[PDB]
Amino acid sequence: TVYTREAYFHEKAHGQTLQDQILKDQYKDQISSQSSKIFKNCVIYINGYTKPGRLQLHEMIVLHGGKFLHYLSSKKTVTHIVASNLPLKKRIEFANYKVVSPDWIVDSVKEARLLPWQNYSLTS
Amino acid sequence: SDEIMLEDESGRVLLVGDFIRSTPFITGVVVGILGMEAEAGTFQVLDIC
Amino acid sequence: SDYFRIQLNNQDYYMSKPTFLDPSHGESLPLNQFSQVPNIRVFGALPTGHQVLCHVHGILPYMFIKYDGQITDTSTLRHQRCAQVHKTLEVKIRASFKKLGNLNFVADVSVVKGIPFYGYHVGWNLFYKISLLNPSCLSRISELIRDGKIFGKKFEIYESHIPYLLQWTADFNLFGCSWINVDRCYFRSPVLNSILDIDKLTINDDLQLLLDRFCDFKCNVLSRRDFPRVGNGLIEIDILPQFIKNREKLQHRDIHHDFLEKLGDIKPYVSSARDMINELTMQREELSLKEYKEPPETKRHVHQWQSSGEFEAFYKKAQHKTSTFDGQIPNFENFIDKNQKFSAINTPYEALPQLWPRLPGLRYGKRAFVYGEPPFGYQDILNKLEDEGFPKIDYKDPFFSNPVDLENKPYAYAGKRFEISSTHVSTRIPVQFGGETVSVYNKPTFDMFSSWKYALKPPTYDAVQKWYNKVSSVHDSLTHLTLEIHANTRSDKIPDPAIDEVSMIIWCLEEETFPLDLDIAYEGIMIVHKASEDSTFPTKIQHCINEIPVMFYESEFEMFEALTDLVLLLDPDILSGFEIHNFSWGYIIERCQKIHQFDIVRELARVKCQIKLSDTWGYAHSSGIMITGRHMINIWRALRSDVNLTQYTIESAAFNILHKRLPHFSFESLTNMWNAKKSTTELKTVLNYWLSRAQINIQLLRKQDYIARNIEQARLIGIDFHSVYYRGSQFKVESFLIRICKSESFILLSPGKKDVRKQKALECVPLVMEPESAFYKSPLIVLDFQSLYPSIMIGYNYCYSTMIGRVREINLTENNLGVSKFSLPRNILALLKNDVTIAPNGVVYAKTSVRKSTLSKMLTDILDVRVMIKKTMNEIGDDNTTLKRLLNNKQLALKLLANVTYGYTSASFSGRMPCSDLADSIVQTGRETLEKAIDIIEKDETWNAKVVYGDTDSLFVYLPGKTAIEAFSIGHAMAERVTQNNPKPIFLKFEKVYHPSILISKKRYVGFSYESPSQTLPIFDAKGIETVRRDGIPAQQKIIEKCIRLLFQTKDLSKIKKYLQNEFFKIQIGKVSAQDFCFAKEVKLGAYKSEKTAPAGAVVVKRRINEDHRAEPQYKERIPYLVVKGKQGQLLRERCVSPEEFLEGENLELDSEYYINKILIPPLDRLFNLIGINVGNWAQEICGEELKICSLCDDCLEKRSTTTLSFLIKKLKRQKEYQTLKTVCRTCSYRYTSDAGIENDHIASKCNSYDCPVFYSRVKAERYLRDNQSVQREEALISLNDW
DNA sequence: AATGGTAGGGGAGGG
DNA sequence: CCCTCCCCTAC
């Protein structure tokens, strides 16, 4: 039928998922059960400026398990959201959500074990 | 508009002559214009009513 | 000059039977003729200004495909293979359409050489050259070829998305709205066509000289029988591709066939930019300005990215994989295969001549002790204080003028504590000595007989005195025509093209750009008047007008025929009108098609014959109705695209642009004033109404410079006049790319829809830093890159022809890059081990040393033009505000063109030549450059400035307490350092500085901007906030602007609170203009999923449609509406009170509470919660003729002498206001009435324009006079006066 | 029948 | 309380 524009975003998301799977298949140097499934059943969305930067943290997220989200269309289908800075309005809107510093992913990758977000929470 | 023009719900013509020039006029009043037709589409004013 | 010149205004193609001026044989198949051949009709204008119809023969569309042969052919098997493939393609195409001969679809196929443009290709590549006879089937044949319907394999097609007209113009170096040069031309049957009096009236000495020099009446004149005239122009000519002298001037370069650039063997790439530069220099020289120059600065760039090491390792691995086992190392000299016998084949531009027709001092004291010198000084105190850790300047935070608004409550928002204290003496802390406050604890002891003196100083004498004292003989433009109509509707139902006839048509050709100075008044009136009607009417109308000649016709058909004849005689190039869909040309066309059964479109066209289907895209976007040979514009749509108004109404547009107010009368009033036996005043009023409409529209088009800007854009891009505003920016990008790349024998890939859909997604996104929601009292420095993406293209060499492929997955068999798959040479990476550039996402790009990109040249030329325009704009200060506006519009257009050139990539939807990898690399390197700039800014210890907000290129730098004077130098230093650390094309400019700035969220900030230190009055700058958004109401915009200005200037929240309370009380009472409380949201009737999801304005549109089907708004047209008071729980869409229904409503009251809450509380809270206060508290804190609480006459206390005085005062004030409003309306209506006496006040009161506040004020005054309250006051007055 | 992308926010109706 | 559709703006 007509391509329109609503289905274009869905096709873009499907293509992003396929490319992430292809990149994961290409990157076979990761050890099994170590630094490869630390972010299992976890969805991470990058918001705002990050010190490691996106398209680099994206590789660490994709290779080490889990799915990467480029658009936060639905708030249910996301576990952890990464944002170095958040305004007051967005802090109010995103209450009771797990917002962590961008150093959490690199710390978990270096430690080779999933790290709790209690200490790495953006608040306080 | 520096010239006085007449209307009677049927048409508008130009009025010329020294008789009507030296007389103030306000729209909404009616007068009886008498005279002869000029060379152009204008009516000369000779006597007034 | 010595060359025939015709300005290419409009271009069209039509199929015709072959003649002896057209090629009747094909090189591939010399034994087969052509059933039909394509011909191009060009509607041109001579430099004298006369129109001319130009026929172009021998132009055949062609497309390229991969060659299935080899490079070792002996020039004999190639012809046989071409003949076989041509026969197979023709047979398959004809079978699909549903040996023999008589070729009709495919003309000829040849073998040509070329360099592919999609990817890095160096060696010569052979391509087939399939020439088609029907340009309309190009897309269908491309789709058939790409799907492998003809051949077994799915052969890739090249150069198929380019339009036939665009391809021909690029091949022949033709520019839209530009002269064409021919050495000789073949004249048609008559040397001067005379439809009515065209030959006699348009005859001039210049035409005589031109036709005597370029025609001899023996050879140039063609036979009447074989070549009859087709066009409705004064002169029609026929040319050949050999005749056109616009070619042979292009610079053809062959450097892409090998590493010529690297070996060293052998700026204005686009010729259109030179003309624009020369014109701009001539314009700036008229002001006695200086020369043009730009001093560059040396850049000390190193630039490794975040993942440079991994990409380098992967590149090394790929080079190890794709390399021959030992052997000789590749060299730039012998890498290509020499002696390949490629000279036999012909270049793409050398194949164009083939298949052509080929026609034939104070003392201290007696004993004084001196103390030690102070540790600090006048200048070092500030530096020492700053080093101590406190800001140099302590800007005052928002406060309260009086402590009564403090409320003694903690001020906080989202967990952030805010300290707000008043400057009043009540809340000021006492002065403390040694860190401990001092105060009296014991009760005061007052004595007897104590004298006191006032403390506050009185105003000075000087202040009171000061207060009292103050209180070229060459046609280079397009002819223009404007038409408007008047219809006698029945009752109040608006014009109807089915039951209502046209009674009057007014035309006014634009005399500014109309040449030939023929005998016409430039304005005319056409009115139908049957002889059976009242007599002396034509004489009355002529005497009423007495300036513009008026033509009268018995019937509407005769008037339409006369209008068509006048259009043919004048032959305008542009037909206009405010709304050419429901009125003007559209109404006449609908009437002729429906009731008169006349095809007036063909008659109005410039061709007698040879003209299909309607185009919904034209109706939706612009220029719904198409007339051959003429360009039509939806002028209201053009104004919508140009200026950001809120109503887009002719009266509103006139008031907003030309500063002229035009009364609007209902169609019932028009049909009651246009009837017979009426006064001359009414006829004069309606005639002047239509004349003012036409003249105002003409002046609007002249002031907006729409025609001139579009002509300049067409000349620069090269497309025709129509495609500038009809087609998208992708057409301009394709035209520029084709024109630039055709000089290097480049071949452009044409991927299909499936290839674009299946392309890689765009994961890389631009950086949008989240701002901190706070009120920045200290000056904020904003730094924005100028043409960041074009600078990236210029510097890092990012283009389609300089892509080796993604760094990963590289192999010598098959790689995926963009929308195509190709193969790399055996040792391409080993030879290019040094002249390569790695993109931040992992894409290898060739260095500028080995390959210079065409996109780089085009973007460099565009950026040079834009920089010169900006320099000229900055060089002129307040000398000519219209020239500055025109230059700003031109530079906006250039920036938009550069942005569209970038946006040709990443076009995953509706993209003809997209490439995900290139655009991803561009945005990723832009984000990396922004991150590096942020790191550089934050690294330096000379300024503790921290970036708080950042756009895709913009950078918001906070400067705490820098006094706003050193901030200019600090920002200049930051910009210079960032530019030095970046590449040569990349430049960073200071732009402006935000002294008072509020950051709400992403893409939403408001503050005061200081463009230059010399500026004294700051300019209000708002982005994304409700002030600039049109989804609200003017009242909320004004309130927000006033509150923001008060907060930024006085910094006293008490004044803002008082103003807000006053506004809320005024809204609740009802003393509002009722014009600033109406919404303006466009509605798309056909773009709604369901009625439930339809917008608020859709309900009003449907309600208006139900009562009358002719009130159908155009696509994306704003529909005003208001929200009246309703029952509790009622939906917002339910009420949907239209302004016409609201004003006519006897007992309709606007929802004061709904407005006050839902239009003011959210935006004011968003703009003020960053300070620590909420506007909701301020909003919530706010029987009987007089206000005795309660009480016949409804008055407890008599107080006759005061009550009657108050009633008289109120009545007198209301009557005086009404009289002033009536006088103003009468003066305004004098423009049409041309009379200040009786029968003009009635016309003035008949006005009901909704774009003028005077009408709303008059309606309110009439309602107040006719209200029940006025009756009650009169009854009370009578009762009190009854004594 | 034509359409250049990216992102972000807010308001109304239905859960 | 959160999702979806419509409107609008900034790059």
Ligand SMILES: Nc1ccn([C@H]2C[C@H](O)[C@@H](COP(=O)(O)OP(=O)(O)OP(=O)(O)O)O2)c(=O)n1
């Ligand atoms: N409609 C747009 C606007 C911008 N951009 C991209 C390309 C631009 O290079 C970048 C920043 O655009 P700006 O509007 O900030 O301005 P420019 O970079 O074009 O130049 P200048 O700052 O001189 O106006 O965003 C885009 O792709 N599409």
Ligand code: SF4
């Ligand atoms: S309302 Fe009075 S003022 Fe406003 S336009 Fe109509 S007439 Fe002129």
Ligand SMILES: [Ca+2]
């Ligand atoms: Ca910019």
